[PDB]
Design a protein around this motif. Structure first.
Motif, PDB file in Angstrom:
ATOM      1  N   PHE A   1       2.685 -12.788   8.264  1.00 16.10           N
ATOM      2  CA  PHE A   1       3.376 -13.165   9.481  1.00 16.10           C
ATOM      3  C   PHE A   1       4.479 -12.158   9.723  1.00 16.10           C
ATOM      4  O   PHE A   1       5.323 -11.938   8.855  1.00 16.10           O
ATOM      5  CB  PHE A   1       3.964 -14.565   9.359  1.00 16.10           C
ATOM      6  N   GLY A   2       4.476 -11.537  10.895  1.00 13.10           N
ATOM      7  CA  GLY A   2       5.494 -10.555  11.210  1.00 13.10           C
ATOM      8  C   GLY A   2       5.165  -9.725  12.427  1.00 13.10           C
ATOM      9  O   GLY A   2       4.457 -10.181  13.325  1.00 13.10           O
ATOM     10  N   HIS A   3       5.684  -8.504  12.467  1.00 11.54           N
ATOM     11  CA  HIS A   3       5.437  -7.631  13.603  1.00 11.54           C
ATOM     12  C   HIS A   3       5.062  -6.236  13.141  1.00 11.54           C
ATOM     13  O   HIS A   3       5.681  -5.692  12.231  1.00 11.54           O
ATOM     14  CB  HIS A   3       6.668  -7.591  14.502  1.00 11.54           C
ATOM     15  N   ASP A   4       4.055  -5.649  13.772  1.00 16.17           N
ATOM     16  CA  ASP A   4       3.588  -4.335  13.352  1.00 16.17           C
ATOM     17  C   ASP A   4       4.712  -3.315  13.379  1.00 16.17           C
ATOM     18  O   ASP A   4       4.872  -2.536  12.439  1.00 16.17           O
ATOM     19  CB  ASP A   4       2.446  -3.873  14.255  1.00 16.17           C
ATOM     20  N   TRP A   5       5.497  -3.318  14.448  1.00 13.97           N
ATOM     21  CA  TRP A   5       6.583  -2.351  14.572  1.00 13.97           C
ATOM     22  C   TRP A   5       7.589  -2.508  13.440  1.00 13.97           C
ATOM     23  O   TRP A   5       8.168  -1.524  12.984  1.00 13.97           O
ATOM     24  CB  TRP A   5       7.269  -2.472  15.935  1.00 13.97           C
ATOM     25  N   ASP A   6       7.792  -3.735  12.977  1.00 13.81           N
ATOM     26  CA  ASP A   6       8.700  -3.957  11.862  1.00 13.81           C
ATOM     27  C   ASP A   6       8.298  -3.044  10.720  1.00 13.81           C
ATOM     28  O   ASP A   6       7.152  -3.075  10.269  1.00 13.81           O
ATOM     29  CB  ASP A   6       8.663  -5.420  11.426  1.00 13.81           C
ATOM     30  N   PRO A   7       9.241  -2.228  10.238  1.00 14.96           N
ATOM     31  CA  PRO A   7       8.915  -1.273   9.174  1.00 14.96           C
ATOM     32  C   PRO A   7       8.448  -1.973   7.911  1.00 14.96           C
ATOM     33  O   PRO A   7       7.469  -1.555   7.299  1.00 14.96           O
ATOM     34  CB  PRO A   7      10.250  -0.567   8.915  1.00 14.96           C
ATOM     35  N   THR A   8       9.148  -3.027   7.518  1.00 13.73           N
ATOM     36  CA  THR A   8       8.775  -3.752   6.306  1.00 13.73           C
ATOM     37  C   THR A   8       7.334  -4.242   6.385  1.00 13.73           C
ATOM     38  O   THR A   8       6.562  -4.115   5.422  1.00 13.73           O
ATOM     39  CB  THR A   8       9.733  -4.922   6.085  1.00 13.73           C
ATOM     40  N   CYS A   9       6.954  -4.806   7.535  1.00 17.21           N
ATOM     41  CA  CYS A   9       5.559  -5.159   7.757  1.00 17.21           C
ATOM     42  C   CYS A   9       4.669  -3.931   7.683  1.00 17.21           C
ATOM     43  O   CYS A   9       3.529  -4.022   7.219  1.00 17.21           O
ATOM     44  CB  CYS A   9       5.393  -5.848   9.111  1.00 17.21           C
ATOM     45  N   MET A  10       5.172  -2.778   8.126  1.00 16.22           N
ATOM     46  CA  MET A  10       4.397  -1.546   8.028  1.00 16.22           C
ATOM     47  C   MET A  10       4.122  -1.182   6.574  1.00 16.22           C
ATOM     48  O   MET A  10       2.991  -0.832   6.217  1.00 16.22           O
ATOM     49  CB  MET A  10       5.133  -0.416   8.745  1.00 16.22           C
ATOM     50  N   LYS A  11       5.143  -1.276   5.716  1.00 21.22           N
ATOM     51  CA  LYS A  11       4.946  -0.990   4.298  1.00 21.22           C
ATOM     52  C   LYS A  11       3.940  -1.953   3.682  1.00 21.22           C
ATOM     53  O   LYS A  11       3.014  -1.538   2.970  1.00 21.22           O
ATOM     54  CB  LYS A  11       6.273  -1.072   3.542  1.00 21.22           C
TER      55      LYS A  11
ATOM     56  N   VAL B   1      -1.082 -11.725  11.438  1.00 22.46           N
ATOM     57  CA  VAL B   1      -0.708 -12.638  12.509  1.00 22.46           C
ATOM     58  C   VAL B   1       0.627 -12.189  13.081  1.00 22.46           C
ATOM     59  O   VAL B   1       1.594 -11.995  12.335  1.00 22.46           O
ATOM     60  CB  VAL B   1      -0.629 -14.091  12.010  1.00 22.46           C
ATOM     61  N   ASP B   2       0.678 -12.022  14.400  1.00 22.09           N
ATOM     62  CA  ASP B   2       1.912 -11.648  15.073  1.00 22.09           C
ATOM     63  C   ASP B   2       2.740 -12.893  15.361  1.00 22.09           C
ATOM     64  O   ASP B   2       2.218 -13.896  15.855  1.00 22.09           O
ATOM     65  CB  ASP B   2       1.609 -10.900  16.370  1.00 22.09           C
ATOM     66  N   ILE B   3       4.035 -12.826  15.044  1.00 22.56           N
ATOM     67  CA  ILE B   3       4.914 -13.966  15.281  1.00 22.56           C
ATOM     68  C   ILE B   3       5.039 -14.249  16.772  1.00 22.56           C
ATOM     69  O   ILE B   3       4.965 -15.405  17.206  1.00 22.56           O
ATOM     70  CB  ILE B   3       6.287 -13.722  14.630  1.00 22.56           C
TER      71      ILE B   3
ATOM     72  N   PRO C   1      12.008 -11.535   8.786  1.00 17.22           N
ATOM     73  CA  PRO C   1      11.268 -10.539   9.576  1.00 17.22           C
ATOM     74  C   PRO C   1       9.809 -10.445   9.183  1.00 17.22           C
ATOM     75  O   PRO C   1       8.984  -9.990   9.984  1.00 17.22           O
ATOM     76  CB  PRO C   1      12.015  -9.231   9.283  1.00 17.22           C
ATOM     77  N   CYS C   2       9.466 -10.860   7.967  1.00 14.57           N
ATOM     78  CA  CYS C   2       8.112 -10.760   7.453  1.00 14.57           C
ATOM     79  C   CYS C   2       7.904 -11.767   6.332  1.00 14.57           C
ATOM     80  O   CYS C   2       8.807 -12.002   5.525  1.00 14.57           O
ATOM     81  CB  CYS C   2       7.845  -9.356   6.943  1.00 14.57           C
ATOM     82  N   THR C   3       6.717 -12.371   6.294  1.00 15.09           N
ATOM     83  CA  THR C   3       6.327 -13.262   5.210  1.00 15.09           C
ATOM     84  C   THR C   3       4.861 -13.026   4.875  1.00 15.09           C
ATOM     85  O   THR C   3       4.079 -12.588   5.721  1.00 15.09           O
ATOM     86  CB  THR C   3       6.520 -14.752   5.554  1.00 15.09           C
TER      87      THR C   3
ATOM     88  N   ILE D   1       6.330 -14.310  -0.079  1.00 11.79           N
ATOM     89  CA  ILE D   1       6.824 -13.088  -0.695  1.00 11.79           C
ATOM     90  C   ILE D   1       8.109 -12.638  -0.024  1.00 11.79           C
ATOM     91  O   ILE D   1       9.116 -12.427  -0.696  1.00 11.79           O
ATOM     92  CB  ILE D   1       5.784 -11.963  -0.595  1.00 11.79           C
ATOM     93  N   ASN D   2       8.086 -12.494   1.295  1.00 15.83           N
ATOM     94  CA  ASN D   2       9.292 -12.122   2.037  1.00 15.83           C
ATOM     95  C   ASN D   2       9.853 -10.745   1.693  1.00 15.83           C
ATOM     96  O   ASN D   2      11.025 -10.478   1.954  1.00 15.83           O
ATOM     97  CB  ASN D   2      10.388 -13.172   1.826  1.00 15.83           C
ATOM     98  N   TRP D   3       9.040  -9.870   1.117  1.00 17.62           N
ATOM     99  CA  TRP D   3       9.512  -8.513   0.847  1.00 17.62           C
ATOM    100  C   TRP D   3       8.360  -7.533   0.676  1.00 17.62           C
ATOM    101  O   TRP D   3       7.239  -7.935   0.367  1.00 17.62           O
ATOM    102  CB  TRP D   3      10.431  -8.488  -0.377  1.00 17.62           C
TER     103      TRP D   3
END
Lengths: 141, 42, 50, 13, 106
Positions: A29-39, A60-62, A77-79, A101-103
């Motif tokens: 759960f998060g956003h593609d642009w979000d860097p953390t989600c990118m990693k 899945v996009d929030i 920002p990400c889970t 996880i959240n990280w």
RNA sequence: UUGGAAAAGAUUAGCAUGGCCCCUGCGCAAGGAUGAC
RNA sequence: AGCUUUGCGCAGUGGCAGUAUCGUAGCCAAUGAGGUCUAUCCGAGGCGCGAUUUGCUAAUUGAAAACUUCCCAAUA
């Protein structure tokens, strides 16, 4: 890029969780642009085909799918969410909350071990599984 | 008119293994069916 | 090659027979004593030889 | 499929 | 010598299905038996005044080859909330015990 | 007979089968030499 | 008719089994794999990858290691 399959509504999510019976459903759960989600998504793609036998990954996009925000406390920002046979699996990472996880860990082997432990505990019948590592300390020196 | 077929040693061994596996499967099915008791170990 | 799906079947159903040669290859009867022992009281060789 | 996500990423970045 | 095996024993194959949910698979065994070709009986061993099953249950199937095939297919199959492990029923009665004692001394 | 109350099965060890080989017996295929007014 | 051979399978005794037993879907191979002896000579698979079915019994650990209602008091 993001070759991992995406779910565009809650219906896709709630039949994707029930689609797999012998494999662990992983939902980011998060956003593609979000860097953390990118990693995390880069790590997942690095191991997308390695765990094809016993795991599946969906993105899945929030903003696109916000119905799970309240029920799953999707405020980070990400889970990362683990399901098996419609049952959520909590993972004891040592971070305080065992649900997500959240990280974003850079090492793909850590995620491989986490998903393997989740699969082993889900097939055996335990709803809560223990991570084979402690993530409270970043292990940086 | 009929022509015979000659099989090599490896083919004969494979056929023997397949026949033994089929016989073992038949014995297991007969034992699990309850028709006759399984053969005495020896 | 993808990593095979982890599974835990029954570890062993029968014993003896070939099973023994199996362990003989790996897991044969070692000394099984004074090698994994620590001798709580005294010290062997030097103190911190390691 | 991939292009649908690429357009979303480019628009949001 | 509980008089309960006189309803399903008809020279059929009895399969012991254990490792099932204590609070589940009350009648799901009947669904499994109906799925099985024989569909004869799917009795579940439960304790009176307990509210839950006792674990393993006895599924009686008339066709022996069909029973063997179903056991091969349903071995470890996720039925209910836990994979049911299917094995062969023992059925060690007084006559069987006497026969075993007679064969033990000889 | 009577009265009363109600580890989602582990681990280790042994024997037999299966696997392979010599030999035996048999079956089968294809034959080899040879006896008999 | 007696006898015998090769090959094969079934059955049985005995023996072997990690320099052992196979799969190989990968590749090469009698249109020749591999050869330091006998080289104008021999003649088969070889190389990489990946394995080493089923039943019974016993023992250990554990409160319980799994087969179909159990317990308590009294008389018969």
């Amino acid at each position: 890029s993001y070759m991992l399959p995406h779910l565009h509504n809650g219906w896709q999510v709630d039949q994707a969780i029930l689609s797999e019976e012998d494999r662990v459903v992983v939902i980011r759960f998060g956003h593609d642009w979000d860097p953390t989600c990118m990693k995390m998504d880069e790590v997942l793609y690095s191991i997308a085909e390695k765990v094809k036998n016993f795991a599946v990954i969906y993105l899945v996009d929030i903003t696109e799918v916000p119905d799970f925000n309240k029920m799953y406390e999707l405020y980070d920002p990400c889970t990362v969410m683990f399901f098996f046979r419609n049952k959520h699996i909590m993972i004891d990472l040592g971070t305080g909350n065992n649900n997500k996880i959240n990280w974003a860990m850079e090492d793909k082997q850590e995620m491989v071990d986490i998903i393997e432990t989740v699969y082993r505990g889900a097939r055996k019948g335990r709803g809560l599984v223990v991570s084979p590592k402690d993530y409270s300390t970043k292990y940086r020196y | 008119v009929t022509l015979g077929v000659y099989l090599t040693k490896k083919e004969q061994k494979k056929l023997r293994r397949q026949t033994r596996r089929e016989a073992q499967k038949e014995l297991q099915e007969k034992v699990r069916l309850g028709l006759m008791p399984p053969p005495e170990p020896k | 090659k993808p990593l095979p799906a982890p599974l835990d079947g029954q570890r062993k159903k029968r014993g003896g027979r070939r099973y023994r040669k199996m362990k003989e290859r790996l897991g044969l009867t070692e000394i099984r004593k004074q090698a994994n022992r620590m001798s709580f009281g005294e010290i062997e060789e030097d103190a911190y030889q390691e | 499929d991939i292009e649908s996500s690429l357009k979303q990423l480019a628009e949001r970045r | 010598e509980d008089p309960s095996l006189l309803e399903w024993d008809a020279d059929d194959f009895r399969i012991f299905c254990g490792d099932l949910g204590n609070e589940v698979n009350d009648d799901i065994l009947a669904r499994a038996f109906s799925r099985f070709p024989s569909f004869l009986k799917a009795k579940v061993i439960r304790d009176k005044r307990t509210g839950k099953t006792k674990g393993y249950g006895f599924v009686s199937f008339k066709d022996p080859s069909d029973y063997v095939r179903a056991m091969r297919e349903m071995n470890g199959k996720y039925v209910g909330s836990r994979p049911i492990k299917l094995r062969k029923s023992m059925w060690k009665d007084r006559n069987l015990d006497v026969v075993r004692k007679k064969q033990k001394e000889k």
